[PDB]
Amino acid sequence: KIELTFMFRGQPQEQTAYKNVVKKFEEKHPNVKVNIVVTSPDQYATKLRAAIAGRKIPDVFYFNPGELRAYVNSNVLLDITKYVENSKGVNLQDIWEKGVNKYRFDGEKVGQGNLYGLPKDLGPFALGYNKTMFEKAGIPLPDKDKPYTWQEFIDVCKKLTKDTNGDGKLDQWGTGLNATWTLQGFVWSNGADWIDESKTKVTVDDPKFIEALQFFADMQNKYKVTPSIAEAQTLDTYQRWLRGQLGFFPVGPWDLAAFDQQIKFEYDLIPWPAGSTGKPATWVGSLGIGVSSMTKHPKEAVELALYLSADPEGQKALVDQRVQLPNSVKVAEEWAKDPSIKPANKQEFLDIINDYGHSFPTEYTYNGEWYDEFYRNLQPVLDGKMSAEEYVKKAKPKMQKLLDQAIEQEKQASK
């Protein structure tokens, strides 16, 4: 009798997993029908923005924690606090506190007060290595606790870069990192950030930031421990990792199902190499599951959001289908200890959540345009056509203008 629209995003294996779990929800609530709108991750923001602009908002949807305040200000997200309190069987205190608090807002600050969404997951972005390749090369395995230095990391990456079939041409590389998702840990571990502590000033022109960015670009262009520009164009580094051509590549929990299907070599997780702080760093991701402020069926919509985020049966299905780690802290701790489930050091995911994972800088700002500007024109640096020092000096005032505007627009939208 009652229809809900659920909008979300995912890689192919995520789409399959959530479609399955939505069917499980529909089996449990035979009166509720769920209509699915799903996109690829890169197409999502545009589609959701269009839907909000038209005020034709899906009943339940994924959203970016960095938009929480903006969404509250424009009355996009329903206050779901009472629906959550009033539903027996769920105790949000069993869920990662860092996850739940990203979607609390008390009228002035994020992290406390009323619930405007539920955490899809936490998404620690670990470093993986190809154990098969190491062992075939006779290189000592990485330590599971002690981070490589940047020099040590390049040194092993060079040893792994070789012509393995003796035809004259390199066919195996140390790594092939995507700056969009892996530059953060190098910047952070080098004691830098995109913005200052107050989150109001752009700081990409910090010598430590420049050093990190230049080191990143140098992996491809100077140290030559990656496929060439043209080789990455031919087949991207994610695909080359799947095919066993790369010694190191990141791993998120959402990758696990895809890796189960496609990766034939043995791989495991380690800390990221550490810069000047000697402490590894990476990001912990998250998406919120929100309910439309204008939903005609708030009780059921929240029941869907709860089934995906906190319900032990919905959660067990998602974890079983290998697209995320348990939202329940206890289930997660037990999961990590089970040696029948690989990677062997999946504990690293929890260490990231608990110890050395950070949030994306845009989670602290009212919108992310200032940060999108940094990446928009980054490619000449990565391709060795422009120095990191020259780019950040050019980008900084453009980023700063956009960040100032976000700060002002917050002031005007919250009145």
Ligand X SMILES: OC[C@@H]1O[C@@H](OC[C@@H]2O[C@@H](OC[C@@H]3O[C@@H](OC[C@@H]4O[C@@H](O)[C@H](O)[C@H]4O)[C@H](O)[C@H]3O)[C@H](O)[C@H]2O)[C@H](O)[C@H]1O
What is the C-alpha separation between 77 and 45, in angstroms, rounded?
A: 16
Please choose which of Ca ion, ligand X, none residue 171 contacts, taking the beta carbon within 5 to 8 angstroms, the exact cut-off set by kind. Ca ion
Please choose which of ligand X, Ca ion, none residue 117 contacts, taking the beta carbon within 5 to 8 angstroms, the exact cut-off set by kind. none
Name, in order, each residue with C-beta under 8 angstroms of 316's C-beta and a sequence gap of 6 or more. Answer: none
The least CB distance from residue 173 to Ca ion, in Å, is 11
Stretch that binds ligand X, among 64-72, 216-224, 339-347, 350-358 (CB under 6 A): 64-72
Q: Which is nearer to ligand X, 41 or 312 (CB)?
A: 41
The least CB distance from residue 267 to Ca ion, in Å, is 22
For the chain, give the number of residues.
Answer: 415
Name the amino acid, one letter, at 300. E
Q: Which is nearer to ligand X, 32 or 70 (CB)?
A: 70
Q: Which is nearer to Ca ion, 88 or 169 (CB)?
A: 169
Reading the block at residue 4, the tokens are 């809900």
> Mapping DSSP to helix (H, G, I), strand (E, B) and coil, where does residue 129 land?
strand
Specify whether the CB–CB gap between 260 and 322 falls below 8 A. yes
For residue 141, the 8-state DSSP code is: P
Q: Which is nearer to ligand X, 32 or 110 (CB)?
A: 110
- Can residue 163 be called a binding residue for Ca ion (CB under 5 A)? yes
Q: Which of residues 151-170 bind ligand X (CB under 6 A)?
A: none
167 is in an annotated binding site: yes
- Can residue 41 be called a binding residue for ligand X (CB under 6 A)? yes
- Can residue 238 be called a binding residue for ligand X (CB under 6 A)? yes
Among 2, 11, 297, 344, binds ligand X (CB under 6 A): 11
Q: Which of residues 242-261 bind ligand X (CB under 6 A)?
A: 250, 252, 254-255
171 is in an annotated binding site: yes
Specify whether the CB–CB gap between 62 and 289 falls below 8 A. yes
19 is in an annotated binding site: no
Q: Which is nearer to ligand X, 120 or 240 (CB)?
A: 120
What is the C-alpha separation between 55 and 295, in angstroms, rounded?
A: 11
Residues 261-290, mask of contacts with ligand X (x by CB under 6 A): ------------------------xxx---
For residue 353, the 8-state DSSP code is: I
Residues 106-145, mask of contacts with ligand X (x by CB under 6 A): --------------xx-x----------------------
Name, in order, each residue with C-beta under 8 angstroms of 84's C-beta and a sequence gap of 6 or more. Answer: 90, 92, 115, 118, 302, 306
> Mapping DSSP to helix (H, G, I), strand (E, B) and coil, where does residue 317 land?
helix
What is the C-alpha separation between 188 and 190, in angstroms, rounded?
A: 5
Q: Which is nearer to Ca ion, 144 or 162 (CB)?
A: 162
The least CB distance from residue 167 to Ca ion, in Å, is 4
Specify whether the CB–CB gap between 183 and 216 falls below 8 A. yes
Q: Which of residues 173-202 bind ligand X (CB under 6 A)?
A: 181
- Can residue 231 be called a binding residue for Ca ion (CB under 5 A)? no
| Positive/negative CA dihedral, 55, 61, 63, 65 | positive
> Mapping DSSP to helix (H, G, I), strand (E, B) and coil, where does residue 167 land?
coil
**Selection from 7, 11, 41 nearest residue 22 by Cα:** 7
Beta bridge partners of 267: 130
- Can residue 360 be called a binding residue for ligand X (CB under 6 A)? yes
Among 169, 264, 330, 415, binds Ca ion (CB under 5 A): 169
What is the C-alpha separation between 178 and 250, in angstroms, rounded?
A: 9
Among 206, 268, 348, 363, binds ligand X (CB under 6 A): 363
Cis peptide upstream of residue 343 (ω within 30 degrees of 0): yes
169 is in an annotated binding site: yes
Beta bridge partners of 74: none
Which residues define the annotated binding site for Ca(2+)? 163, 165, 167, 169, 171
Q: Which residues bind ligand X (CB under 6 A)?
A: 11, 41, 64-66, 120-121, 123, 181, 238, 250, 252, 254-255, 285-287, 360, 363
